[PDB]
């Protein structure tokens, strides 16, 4: 029944700027010392950072830093950098005769905040094997971009599209900072082949960039 | 010092899971061990702790279902968690934490899915670069990794040598209820009739690997 309240759930911050994550313990922790500090970056495990409310992990850079006084426990990052994009948990362990619990925090998403960014559009037409196969895939990439928000629709000779295709992004690059989108277009062989022009449309702010093909020609 | 999980993988609704976290470098009895979990996109989630002692320690809602024991002749610690529903699917770790000791140790993970359907091995089809560029100086090109299940898939480039510029997305759950995901890389526009470019896709559930040459069209 230990809860450790994480604030905020995320935030935005750009490269340089000092950031403060806060944990309130709803409980004496342990001996008011088992405290951590873990980061996940995207498809790892978490690591710690720190332990022991301020022990600074020999692995980790001396930006990172953690502090405690009552129930709130801190992390602060002195001067952020792109490779701090990662979700951060605070964990407490509360110890007893019969109790020995844990609980982390519900985690704090830290974005990089960067300049706009526009997308390397690319299509790709369906191989010849896939088309024997009976299915078509067409897919439309949009590289090393910012914001996240854009708008990618397609068109099949100049017919807008609906419920045919499916978004996939990745998350923000450790080094730059930017995005990458997919957008896969899926028809069946049949009707892949009753059509000549395939255009992937990218729209962000002022700018709309289309890139597209005629089926059968290269 | 290592963290292993072994077991997980597919799992069918109503059964359990057994999972394994075996310590190489170090006595499994030398410390006491957490399990946590990750549902997908989700946050983290304490499920047990066993005492360098021996005692098991479960978190509220994990209690009545979760047993959690260690073997020192093997050196493992177990995790076993009966009645699995859907809300189940995550990677499961086994982690000593180290919340105020200096030691901490976690494994990479095991990702159990929930799912009563079978073990679909992927089809690999060529994201193909022009021959003649149409973007610069730089290309893209990939491979589309299609209609598999359970994940994950993992891809690599010229079999590791090829890491810059490569973005492996995450996969979609197709209508069908397989998974799909496209791995793409920019190359110099140049380099292509020269450097040979080969995606190698691997879906250990289903023991399959597939290496893919992809050519300019």
């Known amino acids: 029944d230990i809860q450790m309240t994480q604030s905020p759930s995320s935030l935005s911050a750009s490269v340089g700027d000092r950031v403060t994550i806060t944990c309130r313990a709803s409980q004496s922790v342990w001996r008011n010392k088992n405290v951590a500090w873990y980061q996940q970056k995207p498809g790892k495990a978490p690591k710690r950072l720190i332990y022991?409310?301020?022990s600074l992990y020999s692995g980790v850079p001396s930006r990172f830093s953690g502090s405690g006084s009552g129930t709130d426990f801190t992390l602060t990052i002195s001067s952020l950098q792109p490779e701090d994009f990662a979700t951060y948990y605070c964990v407490g362990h509360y110890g007893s005769e019969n109790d020995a619990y844990y609980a982390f925090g519900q985690g704090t998403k830290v974005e990089i905040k960067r300049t706009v960014a526009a997308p390397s559009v690319f299509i790709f037409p369906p191989s010849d094997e896939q088309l024997k196969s009976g299915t078509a895939s067409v897919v439309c990439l949009l590289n090393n971009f910012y914001p996240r928000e854009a708008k990618v629709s397609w068109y099949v000779d100049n017919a807008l599209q609906s419920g045919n295709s499916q978004e996939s992004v990745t998350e923000q690059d450790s080094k730059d900072s930017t995005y990458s989108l997919s957008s896969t277009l899926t028809l069946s062989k049949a009707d892949y082949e009753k059509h000549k022009v395939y255009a992937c449309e990218v729209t962000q702010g002022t700018t709309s960039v289309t890139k597209s093909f005629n089926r059968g020609e290269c | 010092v290592q963290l292993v999980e072994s077991g997980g993988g597919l799992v069918q609704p109503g059964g359990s899971l057994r999972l394994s976290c075996t310590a190489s470098?170090?006595?499994?009895?030398?410390?006491?061990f957490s399990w946590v979990r990750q549902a997908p996109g989700k946050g983290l989630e304490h499920i047990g702790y066993?005492?360098?002692?021996?005692?098991?320690f479960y978190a509220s809602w994990a209690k009545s279902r979760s047993t959690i024991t260690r073997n020192t002749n093997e050196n493992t610690v177990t995790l076993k968690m009966n009645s699995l529903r859907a809300e189940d699917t995550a990677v499961y770790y086994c982690?000593?934490?180290?919340?105020?000791?200096?030691?901490?140790?976690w494994g990479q993970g095991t990702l159990v899915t929930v799912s009563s359907a079978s073990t679909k091995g992927p089809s690999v089809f060529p994201l193909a670069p022009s021959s003649k560029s149409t973007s610069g100086g730089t290309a893209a090109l990939g491979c589309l990794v299609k209609d598999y299940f359970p994940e994950p898939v993992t891809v690599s480039w010229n079999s590791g040598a090829l890491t810059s510029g490569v973005h492996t997305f995450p996969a979609v759950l197709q209508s069908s209820g397989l998974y799909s995901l496209s791995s793409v890389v920019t190359v110099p526009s140049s380099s292509l009739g020269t450097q040979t470019y080969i995606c190698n896709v691997n879906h250990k559930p289903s023991n399959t690997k597939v290496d893919k040459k992809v050519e300019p069209k």
């Open positions: 022991a409310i301020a």
């Open positions: 470098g170090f006595s499994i009895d030398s410390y006491g």
């Open positions: 982690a000593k934490l180290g919340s105020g000791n200096p030691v901490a140790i």
């Open positions: 066993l005492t360098a002692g021996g005692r098991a």
